[PDB]
């Protein structure tokens, strides 16, 4: 299909088009991607992801189109320790892709110790960074292997719910992330990116999450998206 | 997801979410149900289907609601045969169906000489046996409602089939290019013959008499409501 829309206003337990990887299953009507215990408590080393069934035609060579497309979603992030991690990313990939192996921790459940475009909210720390502030979290875009090639500081509140825009348009090559929370709190970062040179014709698109030795849960609340081919 | 929706304005050969059943394959960027030869004649005996591989929420029995849904699709059939058959069918069915053992000719690939929901368009000979048909089929009741239809060689049939959940109609309009209109419509629960969730999708076949049954264009969308 030219274009393919799909909206969950909530998670509840009977999935069908959802393709769960690692630890990632339906807790309260909402996808629990890092595993949590009896309590709802989040647990140390895990890693979870999901992926719409449907494959996105994100581009076609041969009519010169490139998909517009956006991606909806609420998630929140709780933990009983201080420090909760590592986070949350959104991402489009090839649609064969699986958790790599040894990926977990600040890698996300995305990187290993590749054809890939996502946005990732980290709560992890870094001291090595060298595209954001290592003392507070960051919101990062990542284009291949290339991780958070524009960022932008965000702040994690425990247990609230933030929520998230990301929008693609193929005649400027604009991704705009536009997140907020419930009181208004905006956090905005945006970068040029030629989807063809990074990603093949059709992908599949999800979210991924990790916890290593520092957690918190990974809770995604609601997911709508929707994609159609324009010339170009 | 409580919504969900796609379209096809044609079919190229790299597809990616259709289930091929039986003998459906892409040609000339559209799906032909049935099977063709090296010259893109029609074959007899065949038999096929495609499914869109996404689930779709029709009710949920928690909520209390149940998705209000239409389907439009294009489709042609040609034959060098002045007596084409058997004819093509949009249906709605449990995700795991498949192709009922012995259902050839007129069965169209759907009933076994049962939960399912279609719209068939006959050619081949509840309704005037002397002309061709638009028929309702609920469960393993066919044409449970017809309508008087004519068929013609090589021509794109433009149908609408809608599902208001609020009247529990279902909707059924079909033109020609020229204006020619065929519509039939008839009321159904689908909680009472459907899984909460379903698989759609079309299917066609062709017994000693044949024709194509070409899926030129199809575009889908279904809202869960209260």
Excluded: M
Excluded at 11 to 30: M, Y
Excluded at 45 to 63: C, D, M, N, P, Y
Excluded at 66 to 82: D, G, R
């Amino acid at each position: 299909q030219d274009s393919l829309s799909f909206g969950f206003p909530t998670f509840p337990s009977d999935q069908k088009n959802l393709i769960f990887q690692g630890d990632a299953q339906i807790k309260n009507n909402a996808v629990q991607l890092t595993k949590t215990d009896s309590n709802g408590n989040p647990v140390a080393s895990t890693v979870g992801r999901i992926l719409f069934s449907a494959q996105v035609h994100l581009w076609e060579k041969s009519s010169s189109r490139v998909a517009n497309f956006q991606s909806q979603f609420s998630f929140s992030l709780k933990s009983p320790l201080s420090n909760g991690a590592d986070g949350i990313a959104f991402f489009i990939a090839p649609p064969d892709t699986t958790i790599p192996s040894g990926s977990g921790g600040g890698l996300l459940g995305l990187f290993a110790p590749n054809q890939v475009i996502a946005v990732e909210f980290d709560t992890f720390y870094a001291q090595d960074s060298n595209t954001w502030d290592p003392n507070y979290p960051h919101i990062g875009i990542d284009v291949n292997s290339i991780r958070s090639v524009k960022t932008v500081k965000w702040d994690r509140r425990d247990g609230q719910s933030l929520n998230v825009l990301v929008t693609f348009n193929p005649s400027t090559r604009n991704l705009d992330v536009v997140a907020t929370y419930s009181d208004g709190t905006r956090y905005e970062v945006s970068y040029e990116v030629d989807v063809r040179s990074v990603l093949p014709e059709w992908v599949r698109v999800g979210f991924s999450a990790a916890s290593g030795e520092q957690y918190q849960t990974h809770t995604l609340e609601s997911w709508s998206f929707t994609s159609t081919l324009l010339y170009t």
